[PDB]
Ligand binder design. Structure first.
Ligand SMILES: Cc1cc2nc3c(=O)[nH]c(=O)nc-3n(C[C@H](O)[C@H](O)[C@H](O)COP(=O)(O)O)c2cc1C
Length: 149
């Protein structure tokens, strides 16, 4: 039975709420999930022989949240290649602007630039018109969790 590192990138907690639901769903299906609200390469590392998943957002001029910048730089510069990494991605932000989920999209790109192999398609939550993001992400995690071991 699989184990899932559930790495988070936020400055306001809305993507973190979805990550806590994602951990609960995978745990209920039977997989040993673990959510990380303040992650590091040291917590990403234990899952390269396994599976991982991302729940992230956007900040500044369209940059990654500072809570996941040290994970994004760490994997980019001190890991470099991941041909056997398997995962899934949820991204969350405001639809009112051109950088729609651009910080979460950069974290999916962190893994495709390293030859990882996602077990699904990236979910894009529009918080400014979607005040119940659980309803946009729970059936997505329940589905993705059937594609594990
Ligand atoms: C400076 C700034 C600009 C933002 N502009 C965007 C944007 O262009 N695209 C987007 O998807 N999210 C954007 N966001 C994210 C919003 O804050 C959004 O309301 C989000 O849901 C906040 O919750 P989160 O951090 O948990 O995701 C921006 C955040 C900040 C700090």
């Amino acid at each position: 039975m699989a184990e899932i590192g559930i790495f988070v990138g936020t400055m306001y907690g809305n993507s973190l709420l979805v990550a806590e639901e994602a951990e609960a769903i995978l745990t209920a299906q039977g997989h040993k999930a673990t959510v990380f609200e303040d992650p590091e390469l040291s917590d990403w590392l234990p899952y390269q022989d396994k599976y991982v998943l991302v729940v992230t957002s956007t900040t500044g001029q369209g940059d990654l949240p500072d809570s996941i910048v040290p994970l994004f730089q760490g994997i980019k510069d001190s890991l470099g290649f991941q041909p056997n990494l398997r995962y899934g991605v949820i991204a969350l932000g405001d639809s009112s602007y051109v950088n729609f989920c651009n910080g979460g999209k950069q974290f999916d790109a962190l893994l495709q630039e390293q030859s990882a192999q996602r077990v699904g398609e990236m979910l894009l939550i529009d918080a400014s018109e979607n005040p119940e993001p659980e309803t946009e992400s729970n059936p997505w995690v329940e589905h993705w969790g059937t594609l594990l071991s």
